[PDB]
Amino acid sequence: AISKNLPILKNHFRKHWQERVKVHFDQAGKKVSRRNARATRAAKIAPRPLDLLRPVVRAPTVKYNRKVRAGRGFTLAEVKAAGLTAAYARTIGIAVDHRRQNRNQEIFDANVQRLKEYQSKIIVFPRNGKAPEAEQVLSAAATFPIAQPATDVEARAVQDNGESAFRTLRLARSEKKFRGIREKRAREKAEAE
Amino acid sequence: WRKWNVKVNHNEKRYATASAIAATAVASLVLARGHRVEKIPEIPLVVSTDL
Amino acid sequence: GAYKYLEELQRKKQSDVLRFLQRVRVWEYRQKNVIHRAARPTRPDKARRLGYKAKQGFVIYRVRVRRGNRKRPVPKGATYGKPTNQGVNELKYQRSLRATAEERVGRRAANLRVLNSYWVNQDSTYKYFEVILVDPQHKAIRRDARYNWICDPVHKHREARGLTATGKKSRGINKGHKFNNTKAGRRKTWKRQNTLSLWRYRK
Amino acid sequence: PSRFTKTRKHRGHVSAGKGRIGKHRKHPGGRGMAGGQHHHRINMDKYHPGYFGKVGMRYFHKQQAHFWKPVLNLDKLWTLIPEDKRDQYLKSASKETAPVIDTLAAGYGKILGKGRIPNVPVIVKARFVSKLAEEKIRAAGGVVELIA
Amino acid sequence: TVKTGIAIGLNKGKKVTSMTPAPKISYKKGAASNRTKFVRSLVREIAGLSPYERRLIDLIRNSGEKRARKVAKKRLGSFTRAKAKVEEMNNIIAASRRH
Amino acid sequence: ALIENKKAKLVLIANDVDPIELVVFLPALCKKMGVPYAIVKGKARLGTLVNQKTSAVA
RNA sequence: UUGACCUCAAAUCAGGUAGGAGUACCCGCUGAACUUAAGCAUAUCAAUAAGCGGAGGAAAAGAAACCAACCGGGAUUGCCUUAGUAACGGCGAGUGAAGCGGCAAAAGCUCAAAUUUGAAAUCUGGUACCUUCGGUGCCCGAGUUGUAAUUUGGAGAGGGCA
RNA sequence: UCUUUGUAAAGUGCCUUCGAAGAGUCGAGUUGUUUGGGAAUGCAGCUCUAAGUGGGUGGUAAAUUCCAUCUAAAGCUAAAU
Numbered sequence: 001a002i003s004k005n006l007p008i009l010k011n012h013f014r015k016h017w018q019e020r021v022k023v024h025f026d027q028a029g030k031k032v033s034r035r036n037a038r039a040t041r042a043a044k045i046a047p048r049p050l051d052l053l054r055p056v057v058r059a060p061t062v063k064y065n066r067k068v069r070a071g072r073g074f075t076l077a078e079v080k081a082a083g084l085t086a087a088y089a090r091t092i093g094i095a096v097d098h099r100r101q102n103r104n105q106e107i108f109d110a111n112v113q114r115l116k117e118y119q120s121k122i123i124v125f126p127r128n129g130k131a132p133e134a135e136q137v138l139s140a141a142a143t144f145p146i147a148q149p150a151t152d153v154e155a156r157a158v159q160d161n162g163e164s165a166f167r168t169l170r171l172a173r174s175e176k177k178f179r180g181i182r183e184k185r186a187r188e189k190a191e192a193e
Numbered sequence: 194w195r196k197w198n199v200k201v202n203h204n205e206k207r208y209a210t211a212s213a214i215a216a217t218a219v220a221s222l223v224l225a226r227g228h229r230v231e232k233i234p235e236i237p238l239v240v241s242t243d244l
Numbered sequence: 245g246a247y248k249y250l251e252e253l254q255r256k257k258q259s260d261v262l263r264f265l266q267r268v269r270v271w272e273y274r275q276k277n278v279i280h281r282a283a284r285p286t287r288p289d290k291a292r293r294l295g296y297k298a299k300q301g302f303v304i305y306r307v308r309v310r311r312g313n314r315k316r317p318v319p320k321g322a323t324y325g326k327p328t329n330q331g332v333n334e335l336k337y338q339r340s341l342r343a344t345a346e347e348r349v350g351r352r353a354a355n356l357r358v359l360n361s362y363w364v365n366q367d368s369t370y371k372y373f374e375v376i377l378v379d380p381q382h383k384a385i386r387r388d389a390r391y392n393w394i395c396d397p398v399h400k401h402r403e404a405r406g407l408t409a410t411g412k413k414s415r416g417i418n419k420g421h422k423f424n425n426t427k428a429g430r431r432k433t434w435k436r437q438n439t440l441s442l443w444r445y446r447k
Numbered sequence: 448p449s450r451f452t453k454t455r456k457h458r459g460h461v462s463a464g465k466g467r468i469g470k471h472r473k474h475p476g477g478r479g480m481a482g483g484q485h486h487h488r489i490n491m492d493k494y495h496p497g498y499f500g501k502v503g504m505r506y507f508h509k510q511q512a513h514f515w516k517p518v519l520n521l522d523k524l525w526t527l528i529p530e531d532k533r534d535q536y537l538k539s540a541s542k543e544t545a546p547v548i549d550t551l552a553a554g555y556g557k558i559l560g561k562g563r564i565p566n567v568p569v570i571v572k573a574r575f576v577s578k579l580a581e582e583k584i585r586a587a588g589g590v591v592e593l594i595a
Numbered sequence: 596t597v598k599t600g601i602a603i604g605l606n607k608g609k610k611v612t613s614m615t616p617a618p619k620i621s622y623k624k625g626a627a628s629n630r631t632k633f634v635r636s637l638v639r640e641i642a643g644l645s646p647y648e649r650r651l652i653d654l655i656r657n658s659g660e661k662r663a664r665k666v667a668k669k670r671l672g673s674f675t676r677a678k679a680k681v682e683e684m685n686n687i688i689a690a691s692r693r694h
Numbered sequence: 695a696l697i698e699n700k701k702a703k704l705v706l707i708a709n710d711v712d713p714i715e716l717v718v719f720l721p722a723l724c725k726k727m728g729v730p731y732a733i734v735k736g737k738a739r740l741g742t743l744v745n746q747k748t749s750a751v752a
Numbered sequence: 753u754u755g756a757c758c759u760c761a762a763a764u765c766a767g768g769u770a771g772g773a774g775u776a777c778c779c780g781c782u783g784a785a786c787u788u789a790a791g792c793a794u795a796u797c798a799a800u801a802a803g804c805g806g807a808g809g810a811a812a813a814g815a816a817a818c819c820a821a822c823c824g825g826g827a828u829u830g831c832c833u834u835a836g837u838a839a840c841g842g843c844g845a846g847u848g849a850a851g852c853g854g855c856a857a858a859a860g861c862u863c864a865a866a867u868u869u870g871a872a873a874u875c876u877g878g879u880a881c882c883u884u885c886g887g888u889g890c891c892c893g894a895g896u897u898g899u900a901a902u903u904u905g906g907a908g909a910g911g912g913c914a
Numbered sequence: 915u916c917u918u919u920g921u922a923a924a925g926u927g928c929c930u931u932c933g934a935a936g937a938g939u940c941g942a943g944u945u946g947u948u949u950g951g952g953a954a955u956g957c958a959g960c961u962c963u964a965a966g967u968g969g970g971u972g973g974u975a976a977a978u979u980c981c982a983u984c985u986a987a988a989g990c991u992a993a994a995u
Contacts, residue, residue: 001477001790002487005494008480010836012847014788014797020439023194024831027444034856034994041993052858060825061852062602063515065609066551069853072826076906077616085925086906090860098906099816099826099984105612106823151552154532157543158568158590164581165573165591172604179605200445245695246897247865248631248934249719252638255937258645258963261718283759286713288897293864293936294988300876300894313946313959317782325785327793334946336958339781347805354770360988363938371938381769384876384894390863393990397808404806405779409988415780416956418986419818419827421973424850425799425949425956428813428829429779434799436830437849447832477790480845486790501843507952508973509838510820512852574602593601595609595823596981598823609823620905623933624985625968630866630934633698635966641722647963669962672942674977676964683965695867712758716897737897738757747757750897 042138047125051140052095053118055111058104070146073097074111081108082115092124093140106149117144247289254287270365273306273372279352282306282374286364291376294360294409297391301382303356307345308370313337342410345373346403353377357394358403361410516556521564521580524571527553540567542588547572551594558591651684660685702729708737708750717750 024030042050055078057071073095076086086096094115102108121143123134137143216222218237223230230236256262269286282304285291296302314337316323321332337344346361356377365372379385380395393399402408406415416426425433449455457463465471476486483491484499491498519527527548528536536546545568550558558573560580568588574595581591598608644652647670654663660681667684668677696702697720705724711717724731734740740749 001474001479001481002483002490004490008495008498010846012836014846015438016797016800017438017440019800020435021194021442022439023442024444030856037857037993057825058823059853060820060822061510061512061515062822063512064853065822065824066554067853068823069825072858087925095858096906097826099818101616101824101826103614103616104823105614108614151549152547155544155546156570158545158570158588160585160590164578164585165576165593166578166581168593168601169575169603172599172601172607176603176605194440194442196446198444245866245934246716246719248634249638249723250715251865251936252634253642253715253719255939255964256638256642256645257938258647259642261642265714284713284897286715288713288716289865290936292898295863297899298895298897299874299899311959323784328795329784331946334959336946336960337781338947338958340958343781351770351805355768356770366938379769382876388875398811399807401806404781405812406781406806407779407812411780413987414957415812417813418956419814419816420971421819421850421951422955422971424951429811430799430948430956431780432778432812433849441831443832474790478788478845481788481790482845484844499844505952505974506838508850510851511834511837515852595598595600595602595607608821611823619984620907620933621935621985622905622983623967624905624935625966626933627966627968628932628934630932631966634934637719637722637726640726641719645963669942671962671964672940676941679965679968696869699867701869710758711897713897736757741757744896746896748897 047134047136049093049136049140050138052093053140053144054095056107056114056146058107068146068148070141075100075102077102078108078111078115081112094118114144250287250289266365270367270372273308273365274370279305279307279349285374290362294362294376296376299384301379301385303377303379305349305353305375305377307349307375308372309341309345310369311341311371339414340410341371342373343414346375346408349375350401350403357399358408360408516575517554518557518559519550519555520559520561521583522561524548524564537565537567542568545570545589648684651680652688655684655688697723697727697729700727700729705729705731706734706752707731708740709733709735710737711750
């Protein structure tokens, strides 16, 4: 059962695994069916851009803090700032997030500017017009790309004061570590007459 | 669930493609393939883009 | 409005008003059949907040189920297997008593659709519940688009498959880290994470 | 392929290479990792010391993203500066126009000092830094600016 | 809350311009209303008191707060509910003496 | 709603409301708000008054 | 004496609905043992087979009593990944997810509980007509213990000012 | 080919007052079962049983102080699967 020098393996195949095996033979088939569905869907909404204008958003964790991505919908704060209503925007392809908040100005401006860029670059047909077909684009995401904002210039002056940036990390960790203990010491000094 | 498709490195594919294009211009390999190019004035045979 | 008063009073279950009404009502309901048709709901506020409306085609049934564990139905308690499966007595039914109450009613009034159900009373042997049923082929429900969704065949025997409030509670259908085993369905989740996915170009 | 296997070469030989005396039976020593303490002890102890037992503390709900801190060594620091401007920066080594190296933007959490950068000043923006890596950066005339 | 601008420490995080957006209406959900109070006052004044709430009142008067809070915790779920129950049993004790 | 707003100059209550829950608070509602109320015999008599079968209040 | 109301009943009363089948997939309930552990009882097989109830072309889920801890995402589902990992296990044999990221597709919402009270404004059925997946009379009704309009937390309602 | 609807429908700005929001349910103990969930992941039986700046959650049980999030015990919903 166990024999010469090999890595110890864990192959979870003690259930009736052979009944639940899926081979994705239809990889090519599904892709064709998906492109057809995209093709037919775009025709049915012939002038419309096949997508809703999605917002810009910072990724949650500390791992993806550095990255900014396409979110779900625009905040009602952002939409009011642009000058529109959620009921109207949902009809002109601007997806709206009621659960989202804005606690950050740069996301606020980047999304509002995304909104003004949308309005100036789209034309809404009146309900009783002549439907002047206007060369539909199939992607609102590709029309307004999500570009990561730039942080600083590529070359600046060097300034130094003598911190090493290592002491400040050790101090920040250590101050945090003993902060709770230092309150209890200060509480005792508060009660000691 | 027998393995049917086998993955080839992209670069090796383009390596073998470039080798196959390069072997196109070699007369000896084209005859050895049996491609009846004895009456072709030159190889690689290139025609005007009217065709 | 008066339903807010009914709401606040009904929370005062242990008070003497509710306790006295409890004893006389539970005796009255027990004397009747284990499932019988309630002319009106005993609580206007509970029935209507769960989806009842005082209109033709909306129904309320009063039902009592037996309480306690579910004894393992084996002759002489012989389970014929490993000791871990030797238990007979202290085994618990996985569905609620509200679920069996409204499944038993749904079989009685099989023409209707179970909208909801709620507790009305309890004693040592019987838990008492009121079931709300909606007549799907009553034209007052076929029209009035606030209610006709239940006429669609995808809502046949919702109580049977666990689509009622107690049915969603028993299947553990809720958001959160606490329901990871039961989000898309426990059996659906299990089959999904017990499938060997093999792509054409093997990963 | 099947035609290159020794199963083809064993055709005609009785035991298929498995021996006449001790044959190919089903599971003569148990299944999987059976008997690892008992009759496979001589293998486990030789090749896999430490296999049995527990070692440390448990951590419930451990999020791997918490500890995401890829390290950038100082000898690899100048690979973050793009190639076209890199040659310009070394030959024009000077304060007041040092390149800004956003280490987090490249995908590294901590900066380690594996050593020997050139004396060209560089501004190094990092989340966490090592003592020596910041020491070496100053000696090259540059600075480490802690980025959150 | 203003971040320290570095990746470690008490207020670790990118120093940004805070905005503190307008409060969500779902945040006010737990607040009381004069509508809901008028109903609850008129419902308590007609419903009465539960047995354990009466036994709690005597426990406060005779045994004290410590013993009352103990039984309330047993009768109710947790410590938090126990103290809140005893606190309201104390308000009814003080109020009923006046009227 | 009439009693809560004090808009009631006089209110009668029936005693035949089989779920008493609907009318139990009515005397106490009528009291604290200071409107005159009488408990009266006949939910059917109330129904006849308001052109109904039952009204439980007039 | 004569009419109601409540509850209960009866009619081959007027008009309907349910039951069974199939069951690959789907939603639940119920539920083993062979086997593996070189024995075996927890474990494993397996929350499987068998058994029972209930659907549709999909079902379930689903617009957070969510995830997070960030400079925050933002219904659900599925794929890639997380990961044979955190974790569970005679800590043995074995078992074993989720957040983030990329993507496919993306769509939102609505009731209860509110102050129509200057008007039950509401709805079934019967007859009549018509341009019959219904509209308009009229009538009996149902319904104030609440059927319409209006609000659903992302809000909203009352009142003052374009 | 079939009116061209009558003193109505909804949306927005500023300012005042309010703003109901689901109970034998949540929650707690215990039992069984289940889960990767480990001083208890879910579910269920029984016992107890709430509240309104409350309640739930924040993966080690418990006081005290905060903070961050959502809003249960009611309901519909195509697509990708």
